Design an enzyme around this catalytic site. Sequence first.
Site, PDB file in Angstrom:
ATOM      1  N   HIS A  97       3.169  -3.113   6.849  1.00  0.00           N
ATOM      2  CA  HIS A  97       2.039  -2.155   6.609  1.00  0.00           C
ATOM      3  C   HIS A  97       2.379  -0.996   7.553  1.00  0.00           C
ATOM      4  O   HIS A  97       3.239  -0.941   8.492  1.00  0.00           O
ATOM      5  CB  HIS A  97       1.064  -2.821   6.701  1.00  0.00           C
ATOM      6  CG  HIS A  97       0.489  -3.702   5.776  1.00  0.00           C
ATOM      7  ND1 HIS A  97      -0.528  -3.353   4.434  1.00  0.00           N
ATOM      8  CD2 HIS A  97       1.039  -5.009   5.302  1.00  0.00           C
ATOM      9  CE1 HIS A  97      -0.313  -4.152   3.628  1.00  0.00           C
ATOM     10  NE2 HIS A  97       0.116  -5.193   3.977  1.00  0.00           N
ATOM     11  N   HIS A 125       0.711  -1.011   0.067  1.00  0.00           N
ATOM     12  CA  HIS A 125       0.202  -0.070   0.216  1.00  0.00           C
ATOM     13  C   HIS A 125       0.877   1.365   0.065  1.00  0.00           C
ATOM     14  O   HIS A 125       1.572   1.569   1.031  1.00  0.00           O
ATOM     15  CB  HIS A 125      -0.817  -0.059   1.144  1.00  0.00           C
ATOM     16  CG  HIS A 125      -1.858  -1.207   1.431  1.00  0.00           C
ATOM     17  ND1 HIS A 125      -2.049  -2.021   2.408  1.00  0.00           N
ATOM     18  CD2 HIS A 125      -2.810  -1.712   0.038  1.00  0.00           C
ATOM     19  CE1 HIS A 125      -2.961  -2.759   1.982  1.00  0.00           C
ATOM     20  NE2 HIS A 125      -3.467  -2.734   0.892  1.00  0.00           N
ATOM     21  N   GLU A 141       1.540   4.080   2.865  1.00  0.00           N
ATOM     22  CA  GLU A 141       2.129   3.319   4.046  1.00  0.00           C
ATOM     23  C   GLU A 141       3.630   3.760   4.152  1.00  0.00           C
ATOM     24  O   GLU A 141       4.547   3.016   4.353  1.00  0.00           O
ATOM     25  CB  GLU A 141       1.571   2.347   4.346  1.00  0.00           C
ATOM     26  CG  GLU A 141       0.169   1.906   4.120  1.00  0.00           C
ATOM     27  CD  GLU A 141      -0.456   0.500   4.353  1.00  0.00           C
ATOM     28  OE1 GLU A 141       0.336  -0.123   4.702  1.00  0.00           O
ATOM     29  OE2 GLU A 141      -1.791   0.328   4.353  1.00  0.00           O
ATOM     30  N   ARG A 152      -3.392   4.524  -2.259  1.00  0.00           N
ATOM     31  CA  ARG A 152      -3.169   3.170  -1.850  1.00  0.00           C
ATOM     32  C   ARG A 152      -3.010   2.163  -2.806  1.00  0.00           C
ATOM     33  O   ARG A 152      -2.248   0.972  -2.481  1.00  0.00           O
ATOM     34  CB  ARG A 152      -3.894   2.955  -0.700  1.00  0.00           C
ATOM     35  CG  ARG A 152      -5.297   2.479  -0.503  1.00  0.00           C
ATOM     36  CD  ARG A 152      -6.144   2.494   0.565  1.00  0.00           C
ATOM     37  NE  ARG A 152      -5.772   1.373   1.533  1.00  0.00           N
ATOM     38  CZ  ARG A 152      -6.074   0.117   1.359  1.00  0.00           C
ATOM     39  NH1 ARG A 152      -6.854  -0.203   0.401  1.00  0.00           N
ATOM     40  NH2 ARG A 152      -5.862  -0.951   2.216  1.00  0.00           N
ATOM     41  N   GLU A 159       1.845  -3.953  11.338  1.00  0.00           N
ATOM     42  CA  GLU A 159       1.255  -2.747  11.079  1.00  0.00           C
ATOM     43  C   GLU A 159       2.305  -1.971  11.982  1.00  0.00           C
ATOM     44  O   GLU A 159       2.146  -1.985  13.336  1.00  0.00           O
ATOM     45  CB  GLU A 159      -0.114  -3.028  11.538  1.00  0.00           C
ATOM     46  CG  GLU A 159      -1.094  -3.796  10.843  1.00  0.00           C
ATOM     47  CD  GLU A 159      -1.798  -3.151   9.544  1.00  0.00           C
ATOM     48  OE1 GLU A 159      -1.219  -1.989   9.003  1.00  0.00           O
ATOM     49  OE2 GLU A 159      -2.792  -3.392   9.406  1.00  0.00           O
TER      50      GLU A 159
HETATM   51 ZN    ZN Z   1      -1.157  -1.561   4.094  1.00  0.00          ZN
END
Ligand code: ZN
Length: 404
Positions: free
Chosen positions: A291, A164, A167, A222, A365
Amino acid sequence: REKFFGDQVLRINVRNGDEISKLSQLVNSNNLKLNFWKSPSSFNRPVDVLVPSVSLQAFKSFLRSQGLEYAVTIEDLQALLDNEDDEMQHNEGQERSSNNFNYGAYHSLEAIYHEMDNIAADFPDLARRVKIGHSFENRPMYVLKFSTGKGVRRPAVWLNAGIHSREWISQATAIWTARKIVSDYQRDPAITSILEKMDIFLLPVANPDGYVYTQTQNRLWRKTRSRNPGSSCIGADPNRNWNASFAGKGASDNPCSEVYHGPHANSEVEVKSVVDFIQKHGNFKGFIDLHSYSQLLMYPYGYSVKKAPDAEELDKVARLAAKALASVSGTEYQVGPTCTTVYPASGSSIDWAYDNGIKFAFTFELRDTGTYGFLLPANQIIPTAEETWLGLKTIMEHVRDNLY
Ligand SMILES: [Zn+2]
Ligand SMILES: *[C@@H]1O[C@H](CO)[C@@H](O)[C@H](O)[C@H]1NC(C)=O
């Protein structure tokens, strides 16, 4: 170029399907042009959503009328974007005069690709930049391969970031990791020992057209940049595109949607490139997806509450990876399966990886939890990188010790 003057990120408390669905509805059909930043989970988590200045009034009035409570977490998005630009602008001036690469900064795709070429040039016996495919707009997809095997195929760990595009902390964390490995080989006994038994493949920018688009046209973009053949809308969610309960829950078949799965599994040539590399190799043991944001560390499954056979093992590794990550700064991560920790989501990298016989499949994340979101200040890159590194070393030591 996209401006976000007066745009606000709003954080909304949600308790049940009444509140969840009406909020889900309101801008999955694009009245108000709201971009969700943190997706609706369930009872638990807070929703973050970007609200365009033009549309501040309607949305807030509607929140009031639907008994939804909100805080304004970012008062002016454009202010944060300005800061980032100057910090970037400045760094590039220093670097151009320095000949240095400052790892405590955000970079263009050209500087990332170049520094990857430099990491390999500097350590020719350990690192090489392997081109694995092409992006939709036809850019190389560049990975670094780390190996003491001298040509031979070894059991392998896959580390990709930036599927993405917005990010940014993932890409920057990933290129810092590449330099960490080569500098800490023959010095740190654990990475030295990891590299003795396994290969590491690092893909800093898994979505390069989106990354360039975020640095030139729209910072909050994204998806990929694929041209959806029966629509004027662009791109698919790279992380909804994988051949793993494809077109299931948490994905849309609307090309305009931020969670559009694509016209078929592995349709996105960026995903196919990785799916192809991995299955050609045939001997991957680890797969780690990086992420942002939320400070989470998750494992399969995500498309179902099915529950992975190795959930117990993956839970214990993730728990210790998080504990060790915390050691550096005090950064607190939640641990758990995807479908519960976030929300039921189909066709993700890590689910595909697990379903394809790669036991240790993990989603990181990274920073933060919502103060800056995707717009994480540059000064937090090296702290995020340095702490995440201990999370990564842990996983890769479990992989080393549990070869199958
Ligand atoms: Zn992501
Ligand atoms: C999805 O994965 C399954 C299981 O390996 C395979 O049989 C199928 O061909 C894949 N689908 C596509 C279209 O790639």
